[PDB]
Ligand binder design. Structure first.
Ligand SMILES: CCC(=O)N[C@@H](C)c1ccc(NC(=O)[C@H]2C[C@@H]2c2cccnc2)cc1
Ligand SMILES: CCC(=O)N[C@@H](C)c1ccc(NC(=O)[C@H]2C[C@@H]2c2cccnc2)cc1
Lengths: 470, 468
C-alpha cells in the first residue's frame, strides 16, 4: 500500500538540511510556463484526484516512518532521513499534513503563465514538507495536458463540423478514447481517460468511469459511452474466405444500436466495394438513423485511406448534398478513423476532407497513444517552484533566473490570480493581491491540514471547460 | 473501490463474446514487438501484471454486479456476459482458466519474435483470451523503458571504454529523474523498475518497493542515490547569498558525494567565481568517494557541459588519462540532467569525445526522456490472435492489410527457438511440434489463476546484460 514518505524524489529526503537555518515557511506555486500547436490556454484538472487519493487523512503512521527509515538507510548508504520531522506530524497532528493548498476551480481555462495552485506549510516545523510533496503534485501535469490537448482537438473538430455542416450536433462523440492499451499503466489509463471525458463523452477506457465516480461524481448515469464494435480477432477467427460471414453475423447481432466493424483485416477496399457495397448492402441500407454501420479502416495513410473509403462508398450508396454544399453519406452508414490519430493528423484529415468537399458529419475519430500517451511535462512547461520563504521572522521573494534560459525564470513572492476589468486573468506577484485592485483572488483553499475543504463535481468541471464557440 | 478485471478492458471487448464464430472452443493469441534503431528488446514486466492483476480470485459476485450496472449505462443496452463471468465464478472460484507461456524475463530478443502467448484452458471461456489483451499489452511500457534504457547503456559503455579504457561505474552513469515527469504513481514504479534492469542510480523511490514486492534482490535495495540540492534549497537563501547556500550544503554533506544545482542565476559565474575561487578550498579538500558534483540545468545541453568543463579546467588541475583524455581531480564531477534523451546523450558523449574530455567526468540524469517520452509504436508492441478451434477444427488465422505489409501477423500455434548460429526464430503453423532444433524458449508463467514460474530481479539483470 501507499506511503507518502516513499512518494518523493530521493534528493528531497535530504532538503530539510539545506534550507537557511530557522526557515518557518516555504511557499511554492505551480504554473504552465509561457514557451506547431501553441496551446495558449490550459484546462486546470486533476488535483482533486491527488488530494483525495494521496494527501488527505492519516497519511503518516509509525509503520510508514519505520518502512521509509530502513529503505533510505540502504538507498543513501547513510542516515539522512528526517525521522524527527515525520514523527512530529504523527504526534502533533495524528499523521495529517500541516499543508494549505489554494487552486483555481477545476475545469477553468486559463492562459499560460498564470498561477494554478499554491502550496505552503501551516506549521513552522514543517517548512520542509512544502517541497517534499512537489513530486506527487507536479504529476497533475498529466490530467492538465490530456484535458488541454483534448480540448484543442475539440476546437479543430468544432471549426470543421460548423464549416461543413452549419451545426455542432454530436460533437461530444467525434473524438473517442481508444487509448487503454497504449498507456503506461492502469492508473494512467483512469487519469487520462477522465481528463478526455472533461471534453468528450466517447470512451473505451473503462478505468476513467470509476475514477470520475469516486473522486468527482456526476448527476448522470455514466460519465462516458461506447457502442458494440469488432477487432481483427473477431473477424479473422472465421478464416479469410469467411470475412463476409463475420460481417453478416456481427451487424445482425447488433441491429438496434450502432456497430463499428473493422474492415481492413485483408483488403479495406474490397470490403467496402464488394462486401458492404454489393454482398451485404441489404442489411446496411435497412439500419436505423440511431443505429448505423460505422466502417473502420486501421491501416495505411490516414487521410488517403479515409478519402478512398468515402468515394468507394459514394459509388455504392446514395450520397446526398447539404446546406453548405458538402457530400454526406446516408444516415445508416458512418465512418471511424482510429489509426494514427493525434492533434496534427486530425487537423490534416478534416482539412483534406473539407478540400474533397466531404462533410465532417460522415466521420468520427478514435485516438489511443496520441491522446493519452504521446504527451510530456514539457508540452505545457508544467512547473513547481518556490516563490516565497520566511526565515527568522523575515519573508523574502525568491525565484530562479538562469542566464542561458530566460523562459525558466519563475515568479516572485506571494501570488494571486485575478479577474481583470476586461474579463481576463492576471497573476499578481509580491503579495500585491492583498490590495484587491482587480477584486478577490480566484484561487480557493482546496486542502488544509489533512482535509479537502472544497470539491468540484465533474459536471461543474465540464461546464467550466466549455468552448467559447461564438 | 478496488481493482476489478471485469472493468479492466476496452469497452468493445465486452461485446466480442457475441462476435466469434459459433462453436469456438479456443482463441490463442500472442505478443511481439513487430519489425519495422532498437534491433533487440528486453522482455520485462509481465510478472508484475500476473501477480498484481491476474492471479487468484479476480471474480466475485459483487464484481459481476458492479460491471453489469456500469455496462448497462455505458452501452445503453444489455450486452454483458453475466452468465460467462458467473461460470468462471462457480466453476473455478473466480480463478482465470487461461494459460500464459512467456520467454524468460530479462531476455534480449530481436524484433518480430513471439514474446508470450495466451490461450483459454476451458472451451466455455474462448472469449477470455482477448478480454485480457488490454491489461497484457500494457507490458509494452516496462519492455520499452527497459529496451531504451539498455540502448543508452550501449552508448555510454562505448564512449566510457573509448575515453578511459574501462567500464567502471557504468551502472551509475544514467540516473532516473523522471518521478515528476511521468503520468501516475503506478507508472513511476513500473518505469523506475525497468530502468533499474540496466542501471543502479535512481531518484524514483517508487521503483524500489515494486522490485522488492514482485521480483526481489539478494542486496537490500536495487537502486541508490546521493544528497542533492534543488533551486528552492539554493534560492531560499536569497539571490546575493548563493555562496552561503553552496557552502552550507557542501558542509552538510562533507563525507558523501553531493550534487549542487549551480545555474539558479549564472552557471558560468558559480563555476568560475564561487566554486572556482571563493569556495575552492572546500572542493580541493574533499574525498574521492565524496566529490562535489556540479549540476548545470539550463541552456544548450552540449555547449553548457563543455563551457562548464572549460571553466573548471582553468581553476582545477586537469590531468591526462591512460587514453590521453582530460580528467578532472577525483573530488570533482558534473551531472547533466536537463534535456537528456537517447539522441541528446549521444550528442553530449559524441561532442565531449571530439573535445578530448573523458566520459569519467560526467554522469547523466534523465526524466521525461527516460520514462515518459516513449509510446507503444516505438517497438510496435502488438497482441494478436494466431490460432482458433471452431467445431473441433483448428484453423490458423492472421491479418494481412493490403495497405501495410509490416502489420501482417503470424499464423497458427507458435514457439520460440535459438538456432545453432545463436540467433532466434519463431515457428508458425504448429511447426514447433516437429522438434527440428532446440526446445521452446517460452515457459508457462501462468495457469488457471496461478503464477507457475517466477524470476528474481537479479536473474533479469543477468539476462539483460550487454555482450562486452
Ligand atoms: C457512444 C456514441 C456513438 O455512437 N459513438 C460512435 C461515434 C462510436 C464509433 C465507434 C466506436 N468504437 C470503435 O470503433 C472501437 C473498435 C475501436 C477500438 C476501441 C478500443 C481500442 N481500439 C479500437 C465507439 C463509438
Ligand atoms: C548512486 C551513486 C552516485 O554517486 N551517483 C551519482 C552519479 C549521482 C549524482 C547526482 C544525483 N542526483 C542529482 O543530481 C539530483 C538533483 C537531481 C534531480 C533528482 C531528481 C529529479 N530532478 C533532478 C544522484 C546520483
Amino acid at each position: 500500500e501507499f506511503n507518502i514518505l516513499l512518494a518523493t524524489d530521493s534528493y528531497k529526503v535530504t532538503h530539510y538540511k539545506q534550507y537557511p537555518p530557522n526557515t518557518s515557511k516555504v511557499y511554492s506555486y505551480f504554473e504552465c510556463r509561457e514557451k506547431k500547436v501553441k496551446y495558449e490556454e490550459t484546462v486546470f484538472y486533476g488535483l482533486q484526484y491527488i488530494l483525495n487519493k494521496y494527501l488527505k487523512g492519516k497519511v503518516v503512521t509509525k509503520e510508514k516512518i519505520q518502512e521509509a527509515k530502513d529503505v533510505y538507510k540502504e538507498h543513501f548508504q547513510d542516515d539522512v532521513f528526517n525521522e524527527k520531522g515525520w514523527n512530529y506530524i504523527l504526534e502533533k497532528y495524528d499523521g495529517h499534513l500541516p499543508i494549505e493548498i489554494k487552486a483555481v476551480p477545476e475545469g477553468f481555462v486559463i492562459p499560460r503563465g498564470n498561477v494554478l495552485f499554491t502550496v505552503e506549510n501551516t506549521d513552522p516545523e514543517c517548512y520542509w514538507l512544502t517541497n517534499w510533496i512537489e513530486t506527487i503534485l507536479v504529476q497533475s501535469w498529466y490530467p492538465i495536458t490530456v484535458a488541454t490537448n483534448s480540448r484543442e482537438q475539440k476546437k479543430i473538430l468544432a471549426k470543421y463540423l460548423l464549416e461543413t455542416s452549419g451545426n455542432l450536433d454530436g460533437l461530444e462523440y467525434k473524438l473517442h478514447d481508444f487509448g487503454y492499451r497504449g498507456v503506461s499503466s492502469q492508473e494512467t489509463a483512469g487519469i487520462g481517460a477522465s481528463a478526455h471525458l472533461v471534453n468528450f463523452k466517447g470512451t473505451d477506457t473503462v478505468a476513467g468511469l470509476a475514477l470520475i465516480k469516486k473522486y468527482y461524481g456526476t448527476k448522470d448515469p455514466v460519465p462516458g459511452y461506447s457502442v458494440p464494435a469488432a477487432e481483427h480477432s473477431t473477424i479473422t477467427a472465421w478464416g479469410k474466405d469467411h470475412e463476409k460471414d463475420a460481417f453478416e453475423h456481427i451487424v445482425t447481432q447488433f441491429s438496434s444500436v450502432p456497430v463499428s466493424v473493422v474492415s481492413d483485416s485483408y483488403d479495406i477496399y474490397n470490403a467496402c466495394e464488394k462486401i458492404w457495397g454489393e454482398d451485404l448492402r441489404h442489411l446496411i441500407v435497412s439500419r436505423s438513423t440511431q443505429a448505423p454501420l460505422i466502417i473502420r479502416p486501421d491501416s495505411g495513410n490516414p487521410l488517403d485511406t479515409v478519402l478512398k473509403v468515402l468515394e468507394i462508398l459514394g459509388k455504392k450508396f446514395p450520397v446526398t448534398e447539404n446546406s453548405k454544399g458538402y457530400k454526406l453519406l446516408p444516415p445508416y452508414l458512418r465512418v471511424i478513423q482510429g489509426d494514427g490519430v493525434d492533434i496534427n493528423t486530425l487537423q490534416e484529415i478534416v482539412e483534406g476532407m473539407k478540400q474533397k468537399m466531404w462533410s465532417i458529419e460522415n466521420i468520427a475519430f478514435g485516438s489511443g497513444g496520441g491522446l493519452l500517451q504521446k504527451l510530456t511535462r514539457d508540452l505545457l512547461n508544467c512547473s513547481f517552484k518556490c516563490s516565497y520563504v520566511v526565515t527568522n521572522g523575515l519573508g523574502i521573494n525568491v525565484f530562479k533566473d538562469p542566464v542561458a534560459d530566460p523562459n525558466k525564470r519563475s515568479k516572485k513572492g506571494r501570488l494571486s490570480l485575478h479577474r481583470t476589468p476586461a474579463g481576463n486573468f492576471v497573476t499578481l506577484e509580491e503579495g500585491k493581491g492583498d490590495l484587491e485592485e482587480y477584486g478577490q483572488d480566484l484561487l480557493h483553499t482546496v486542502f488544509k491540514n489533512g482535509k479537502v475543504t472544497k470539491s468540484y463535481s465533474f459536471d461543474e468541471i465540464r461546464k467550466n471547460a466549455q468552448l467559447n464557440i461564438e
